[PDB]
Amino acid sequence: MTAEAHLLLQQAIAEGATSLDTHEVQPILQAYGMNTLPTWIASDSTEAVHIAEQIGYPVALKLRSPDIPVQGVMLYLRTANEVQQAANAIFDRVAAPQARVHGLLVQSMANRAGAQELRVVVEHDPVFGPLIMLGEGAVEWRPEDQAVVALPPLNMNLARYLVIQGIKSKKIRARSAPLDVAGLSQLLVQVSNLIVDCPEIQRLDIHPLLASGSEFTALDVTLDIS
């Protein structure tokens, strides 16, 4: 629920964590109705294996440090031995020991085959306040050039209108290997609710947001706070 989200953000700030990653933001997103790929934490290659055994294979491993924007992501790990070899490779890759690793992110592999990858960024405009920007999942991000733009507070009616116009302008695809407009719109309203309620959030980046008809799932999430 929400009150836990504020306490989680305030305590992260007090501890000096100004950038929260996918495992840290998962309860905050869920308290606004948004789905995140379950994401666990491994300090040891022995722990990464243990997590992988529970999740079920295949698994991904990503380095939990405030550093990467080299190595870091290891996908399609299908066996306990592959997890251990990959965990040792990233843990030992470390390349000075000055990063506070805490450990490594472990998560199940998502079915991306027939799904669209979107991106949702929230940045602050000096005049207009928080801007929600929705575009296609990819490294190149020209927000002014190729993005749907919403200003909180967003209602479902305006969210749907902005998504439809974004499809018509070819900024977002109508479908690929059928984009549920009602679900993309609902997601934008949830982002808007979160931003309205949590002005601590300086930046929010869902990269990518996976679209599989009815289900929209955030695969990686970064939350900058101050």
Ligand SMILES: Nc1ncnc2c1ncn2[C@@H]1O[C@H](COP(=O)(O)OP(=O)(O)O)[C@@H](O)[C@H]1O
């Ligand atoms: N758990 C996962 N399941 C499926 N695909 C994933 C998972 N995690 C990351 N990916 C894929 O890895 C790619 C992202 O690679 P990454 O190096 O993290 O990009 P960036 O440098 O932009 O963060 C994307 O294509 C994404 O779809």
